[PDB]
Design a protein around this ligand. Sequence first.
Ligand SMILES: O=C(O)C[C@H](S)C(=O)O
Ligand SMILES: O=C(O)C[C@H](S)C(=O)O
Ligand code: SF4
Ligand code: SF4
Lengths: 540, 540
Amino acid sequence: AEFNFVPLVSKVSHKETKYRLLTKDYVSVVQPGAGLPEMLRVDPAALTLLSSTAFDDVEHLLRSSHLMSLRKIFDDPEASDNDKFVALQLLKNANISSARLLPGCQDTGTAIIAGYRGDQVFVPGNDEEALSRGVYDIFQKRNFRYSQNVPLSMYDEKNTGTNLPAQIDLYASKGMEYSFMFVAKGGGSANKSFLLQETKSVLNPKSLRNFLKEKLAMFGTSACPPYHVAVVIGGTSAEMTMKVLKYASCHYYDDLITKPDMKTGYTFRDLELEEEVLKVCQNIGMGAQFGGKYYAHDVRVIRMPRHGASCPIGIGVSCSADRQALGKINKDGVWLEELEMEPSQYLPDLKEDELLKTPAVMVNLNRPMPEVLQELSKHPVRTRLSLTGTIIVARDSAHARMREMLEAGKPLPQYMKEHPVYYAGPAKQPDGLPSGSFGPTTAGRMDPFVDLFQSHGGSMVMLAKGNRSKQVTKACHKYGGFYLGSIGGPAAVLAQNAIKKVECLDMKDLGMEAVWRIEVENFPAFIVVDDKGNDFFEQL
Amino acid sequence: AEFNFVPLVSKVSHKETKYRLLTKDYVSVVQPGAGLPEMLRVDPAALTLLSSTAFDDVEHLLRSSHLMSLRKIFDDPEASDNDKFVALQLLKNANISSARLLPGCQDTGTAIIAGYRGDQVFVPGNDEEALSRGVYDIFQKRNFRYSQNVPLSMYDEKNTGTNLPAQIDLYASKGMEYSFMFVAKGGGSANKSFLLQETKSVLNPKSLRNFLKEKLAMFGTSACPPYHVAVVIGGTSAEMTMKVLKYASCHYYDDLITKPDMKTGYTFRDLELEEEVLKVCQNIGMGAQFGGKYYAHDVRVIRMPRHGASCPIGIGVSCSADRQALGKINKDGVWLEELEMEPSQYLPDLKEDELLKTPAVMVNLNRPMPEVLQELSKHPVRTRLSLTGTIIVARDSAHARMREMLEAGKPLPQYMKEHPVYYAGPAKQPDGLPSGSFGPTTAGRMDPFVDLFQSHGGSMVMLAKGNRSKQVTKACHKYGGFYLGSIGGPAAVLAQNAIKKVECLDMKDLGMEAVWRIEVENFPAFIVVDDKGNDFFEQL
Ligand SMILES: O=C(O)C[C@H](S)C(=O)O
Ligand SMILES: O=C(O)C[C@H](S)C(=O)O
Ligand code: SF4
Ligand code: SF4
């Protein structure tokens, strides 16, 4: 018929989003000549202030709705004891990080910025560079982590030492506002954004539920649940499906129409599938990292148009580092989403000593490794532990380099054969404090090194977060080693309560990915893989 | 560690891109008051004309470099005979479609538009709506296909009848130019954009070579090779990796720095890996759809920075419908990339009879199917055929609706048991011509219907394009049916030379996805799966 323009996705409000005013500075309304409307001149320093403040706030603060979801776990009669134990560490973590000495997570993430500059906004300068200065500034000032590696070739890399580059996308809109979304996206949650190339034949109730049942297990516990799950069914391209997925997991689309109207847009939020997806998450068994009901806080499902030959599907999560802030600049100043500044009020009234039936088994790590293995071998998987002593810290790059050494005929470093290995990379150490945020790394990315290193007598006791592949279960059964699982997410509580001394041992060029040697007291862990073929997550 | 702004990706030239002028209309330079620089006013009709013209051209024309890669196949002593037979049909196809009666492919694709509106460009109107109108206008005027389905619910859908919505992304840049890239992205090549979530442990020559060998086979022949292959190693997010991959497969990044410089950007184009990837593709055995060397015309490899914990990898293809155009609007007018206006000069001087040594086997389809199955059963896979008679046409939505029928206790439609099945959806029929572009659709998306339908006596002889799953070998072996493969891509040659009558038989609500009944004469096809467990592609 006739031309009726309807956008692919309609414009969306954010009615539950409260903004705090940063300043009425930097902004002036001018009346240009020609046939032009009035314009909003914005000084570039306004962009620097907003991006630095926003990342300051998302690295230390959380949304009230998100904290409220963690607190609801304690009242739920169907939540497991481990669900509640995990949620409480994550609530204590928020209380600690609101003081702004320690960020919530050791991975202060990738800085993602999306701005929408209306045609009536004029900025006399370079937008990306002004936003990058704010990112640079705040990561320099706060006790954050430099996590970005730029390539010097295909295979050689260098940490930039500043957490740049930021990913900045500036879009052209209409009107007299500069709107923004800031995201501090952790790497492990970013690794769990998946694109599934599907077809029309999955687009029926029976097929889609069998599909989603299977695919939702792909996150595992590797992205620190409880999750904010998002699903995008359809899309006009793989890059559009994945962009919308990013937005949906940031809850950017909560106010989108929930029924097609063929008027304001072609894309809608499907409340019915969201409830079905939530139930599958509540029945998946993994719960909040160590068994239970709270795989997911909540779910977002967005249905887009598609080419007849296509049905791209996106699934992804926001992790327990749920870090995003809306912002905007208009003729009334610089505005930033208000996050929760009194997170202590979401802490439940209870003694943590009363949440868990059995007390932790205490393991002295400052023993000969055969002794430590002997003590661990007395306990079945699911056994909660409390660890005290020296630990060697190494993750992706240090493991990659040791594999090169082995392949060159060089021995595995001896410190790998004498201590447990904790996969982690610390954020910067605050003045006068024993440790920066120092939580655990995804254990599955190190699975290709386990059999290799244990065949050299190393990596016999591993401490990290997330479930692992069956090859690690077989390797530990083959050589008699252990995978100890930690709670992922509460890096500030660990830095404050458990990590007593931090030294850089080896591979110092790798920044945060260097080999560290740390002293811990009462570090919490569960036995996840034992020396007999048993895996926590294969049982239930 | 001083602040040194370096973009994620540098700005890129397009030095091999010649632009033709459409008009000096619609643009005026004005000098506004205040402290504002001179501005360029662009009438919204300029965006309508540019988008209308760009899509007119990409649907009918190709880049000269692309035609030359096809023509280079004929002088290559290592090109297979089928490589050349395929290349020749695609060269004839380009010659036909340059008349603008028939588009190169029946799938005129998803309309993708990316714009860069400079700070000094003002459009007194709605850019997105003006670009969609040009898309609307040209799909109405030319004999294109309406391919877009908007949801009425999660599972109910409707074709829009216009090929809207377009995917429009407008970025805010600086300066006095409005730059564009227009892409008509086929559904089948878009389905072969894959996101692989990898880690640092793949980032070594041996692992990355093992990884790429395995993953490059994922395209198969389902996206109508020879491909323009693109690979992106790294990226700051999944949506960025997939965005950059789209551009790289459009050859947008051809002028990118080929070595890191730590100044203009952090991303570079890796010529040494492009050379390794091309060799893997030349040795992969699938060739240009039916065995040979020309799986790939060429290769692009982009290396991006990454979070320490992440290595997203994108792989994708431009299909035989390699459809993109750069454009721009400035103070000197409306510009559009010049595509090849005389493709006939790229046809080799050779008789098509001289290319293949064994003649095609002629199969009369106007017989009882047991006769046709007996005739086809005389021949092994790879046997070239030439088919004449009646064929039923049905693909995705029509199969899904017949699967609904069977589960309800409704019989498989009788026409499915009486004729060969052609998976295809036609573009609009030109006035006074027997058929619109009417090439084949990807056969693998119908694999879930094969065993089901043959168990009801239907779909015994299938005609489509691309390799299929092992469950189709077993179903044809179980029930005694055949999958005959055709060359994908040259939909205009088929409409001109092979398709003699077209009728809509059933399911007319589904538009191009309705069930059709066509008469073909000398339609070429190869036996790809027979009634004995043999697969063309399981034997190289
Ligand atoms: O880099 C880290 O510290 C942890 C990352 S965010 C992860 O694996 O989830
Ligand atoms: O939709 C079509 O006509 C064919 C698509 S592009 C495909 O399967 O390749
Ligand atoms: S909460 Fe877990 S997944 Fe998220 S950034 Fe922190 S360690 Fe990574
Ligand atoms: S050339 Fe093949 S893959 Fe590309 S749009 Fe046409 S039918 Fe689809």
